[PDB]
């Protein structure tokens, strides 16, 4: 059956599938195929077309089947990849210090469909047998493909300094003879990016082999994740009081800097930069100051994050979120912008009636100095709503423009 | 005579309670229609 | 509209508790005290009681379709 989701943006939006009938009243999709369809299960509906003749059936079977559609000509790189829970779980799984007991390896092995039926020698024999997620993933990997990637958190200096081929952080991926020698898999190594492990699998082994590869990764990693567990909570949004104090100090210093700049400009001591009126120069200075403050605060929060932090887990695995997202949650949200500028003076020289006139301060012009966890004062909330409205409008218009 | 902040929370919320008890939520609709019927119809008739 | 018979989460019978809970509330027990007296330890059952809204009285305010 051909399977479709409007809007049909590219070839992969319509792809063939083999039907399996299961009780309930929905189309059940494998998580990987969501990416090409650009589909989420937030209520999205999809269409299915049944070819009616053997000729059309053969056409679909030989041309449109998902395995054949794995790699797109648009950017000569795979369209699907391991996503979401599977991505985070594989990142955790392929950590250096992940060890599996006889029974756990037992379950994962049998979930691995393409398994040859031979239990590998455990990476540890005494004082007790123990395997490694790297061993199990080596079993998962098909053929004898060779690949080299770098985990997302891979420091750059490591490549130059000693331990180059023995990563202290295990942040370098090396698959050899179809065996994950070392490294922590992540989006870089399993997603749509070029030269990814899935890409190399498709290139070397058949599309069918890569299909089995996808299925085995998903099943095995989900089953292990059952044991491992993955969550997100207020604990992962909380930071230590020391980092809170550091962020507060940074914000206060940035506010003081903005105040100094404003006072200088009012004294007229400020002078325009080339190719910019004095007001443009002042705005540039303010924006630079606030951006630097936000960047410093985000860096502080990311540093404060612990290895157990689930936000960091997810960002590192690349499944979802971003360092900017973590910074917004933990430290200040940051400046709100409409039309690429600070909040305009909707009122008479005033963003809101609650400020003195001709106030160009961060708070006055809509800088959210509070993190999402800390909550927002009403003015900051209003300005953030303005920004979100800008985003929504941009979406609602670009949809039609790009369609045309 | 004044309202300390601790009291102020409950005070403002009591004020809002009284406001909503007095007005309701569709007060604008009801008042607009009532004013229309009461004044505007007669005004139109006379202006004719 | 009416107090559910079982706690959705754990399945503990709570349908026979709404009237007693109201009785305690009018007896001036705090909600937590009333729940403890009724024995609702798990916060699932505590939720079942706290969040319930007995709309059945408002429904009964209307006369039946038949005399």
């Amino acid at each position: 059956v051909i399977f479709n989701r409007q809007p049909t943006l590219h070839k992969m939006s319509m792809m063939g599938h083999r039907v399996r009938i299961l009780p309930w009243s929905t189309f059940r999709l494998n998580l990987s195929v969501t990416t090409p369809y650009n589909a989420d299960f937030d209520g999205d509906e999809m269409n299915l077309h049944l070819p009616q003749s053997l000729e059309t059936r053969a056409e679909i079977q030989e041309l449109a089947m998902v395995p054949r559609m794995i790699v797109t000509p648009q950017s000569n790189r795979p369209v699907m990849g391991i996503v979401q829970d599977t991505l985070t779980a594989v990142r955790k799984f392929t950590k250096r210090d992940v060890f599996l007991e006889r029974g756990e390896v037992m379950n994962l092995l049998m979930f691995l469909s393409t398994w040859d039926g031979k239990v590998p020698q455990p990476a540890i024999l005494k004082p007790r047998p123990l395997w490694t997620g790297k061993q199990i993933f080596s079993l998962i990997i098909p053929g004898h493909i060779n690949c080299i990637r770098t985990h997302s958190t891979h420091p750059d200096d490591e490549d130059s300094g000693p331990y180059k081929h023995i990563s202290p952080g295990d942040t370098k991926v090396v698959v050899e003879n179809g065996e994950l020698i070392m490294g922590i898999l992540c989006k870089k190594s399993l997603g749509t990016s070029a030269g990814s492990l899935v890409h190399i699998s498709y290139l070397e082994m058949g599309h069918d082999i890569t299909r089995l590869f996808y299925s085995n990764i998903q099943t095995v990693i989900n089953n292990w994740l059952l044991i491992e567990g993955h969550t997100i909570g207020i604990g992962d949004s909380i930071a230590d009081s020391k980092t809170y104090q550091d962020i507060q100090n940074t914000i206060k210093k940035a506010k003081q800097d903005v105040i100094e700049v404003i006072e200088k400009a009012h004294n007229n001591e400020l002078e325009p930069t080339p190719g910019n009126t004095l007001r443009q120069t002042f705005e540039n200075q303010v924006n630079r100051i606030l951006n630097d403050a936000r960047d410093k605060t985000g860096s502080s929060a990311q540093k404060s994050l612990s290895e157990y932090n689930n936000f960091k887990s997810m960002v590192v695995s690349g499944a979802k979120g971003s360092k900017i997202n973590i910074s917004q949650v933990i430290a200040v949200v940051g400046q709100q912008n409409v039309e690429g500028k600070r909040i305009p003076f909707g009122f008479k020289h005033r963003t809101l009636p609650h400020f003195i006139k001709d106030d160009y301060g961060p708070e006055s012009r809509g800088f959210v100095e509070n993190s999402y966890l800390a909550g927002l004062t009403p003015t900051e909330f209003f300005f953030h709503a303005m920004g979100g409205r800008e985003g929504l409008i941009d979406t609602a218009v670009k949809t039609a423009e790009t369609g045309y | 005579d004044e309202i300390t902040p601790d009291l102020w929370q409950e005070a403002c919320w009591i004020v809002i309670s009284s406001y909503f008890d007095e007005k309701g939520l569709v007060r604008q609709q009801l008042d607009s229609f009532d004013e229309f019927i009461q004044m505007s119809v007669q005004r139109i008739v006379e202006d004719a | 509209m009416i107090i559910p018979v079982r706690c959705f989460t754990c399945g503990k019978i709570v349908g026979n508790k709404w009237e007693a809970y109201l009785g305690l509330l009018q007896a001036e027990y705090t909600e937590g005290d009333a729940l403890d007296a009724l024995g609702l330890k798990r916060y699932c059952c505590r939720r079942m009681l706290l969040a319930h809204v007995d709309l059945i009285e408002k429904l009964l305010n209307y006369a039946p379709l038949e005399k």
Partner: protein
């Protein structure tokens, strides 16, 4: 190469729950026992309803749902009862079902509370839990004057797996390794995690030192009954049913191998 030697200790026992501990057994066995408690213990609950009349504000499906959810004492009658599907009787019979009749009419200005008290059983041994002989009767619906509710129902055997209404338990707390000796979990900040009731540790201590050779033993159960069965009855019936399932599986395996 052979079975363990599980031991039991009942640390508490009431009409409404049983708390105990099982030692020298596998986590798999313990978890399966818990699952059987929750899902695969036979029970009698209303599953057939005929609404002769219903003037109440609630509709027929609503009323039937509540009636099914009502629990019924099933201490021994369930064991004698056979599953309706297994039973030969054409429609219903005592061997496979128990009849109930409800008939109330609000003839007074005050609200009439149709509670489980009004549920009239045919077999005295099977009755609403609250009606037993303080716990109040389970409300079903309220009737203003001029309203009526007449219906005839049948309760049959069944286990929670088919539907939650047959589920006897009302909370099966299960635990093991109170102190995290096996380190099956991992506390990023163990200090801030409250001690389990079964935890045996100094307050300064957060969790037991890791045990490389450890294995899950001494599983703590606290089975709360929904009043359908005595908790001890729940446990015993669960064990019996699990053994029955294993025996039937053994029979099927023997048949298959012999055929092969």
């Amino acid at each position: 190469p052979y079975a363990n030697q599980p031991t039991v200790r009942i640390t508490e026992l009431t009409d409404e729950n049983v708390k105990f501990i099982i030692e020298n057994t596998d986590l798999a066995v313990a978890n399966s026992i818990r699952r059987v408690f929750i899902a695969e213990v036979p029970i009698i609950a209303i599953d057939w309803v005929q609404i002769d009349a219903n003037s109440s504000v609630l509709h027929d499906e609503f009323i039937a749902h509540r009636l099914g959810l009502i629990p019924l004492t099933s201490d021994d009658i369930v064991d004698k009862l056979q599953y309706s599907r297994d039973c030969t009787c054409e429609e219903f019979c005592p061997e496979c079902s128990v009849e109930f009749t409800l008939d109330v009419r609000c003839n007074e200005d005050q609200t009439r509370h149709v509670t489980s008290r009004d549920l009239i059983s045919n077999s005295p041994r099977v009755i609403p839990v609250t009606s037993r002989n303080e716990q109040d009767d389970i409300l079903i619906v309220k009737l203003r004057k001029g309203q009526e509710l007449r219906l005839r129902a049948y309760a049959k055997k069944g286990f929670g797996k088919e539907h939650a209404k047959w589920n006897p338990t009302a909370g099966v707390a299960f635990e093991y390794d109170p102190d995290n000796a096996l380190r099956h979990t991992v506390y990023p900040k163990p200090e801030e995690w409250p001690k389990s009731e079964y935890s045996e540790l100094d307050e300064d201590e957060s969790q037991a030192p890791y045990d490389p050779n450890g294995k899950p033993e001494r599983f703590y159960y606290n089975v709360e009954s929904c009043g359908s069965l005595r908790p001890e009855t729940i446990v015993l019936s669960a064990l019996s049913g699990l053994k029955k399932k294993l025996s039937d599986l053994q029979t099927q395996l023997s048949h298959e191998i012999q055929s092969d």
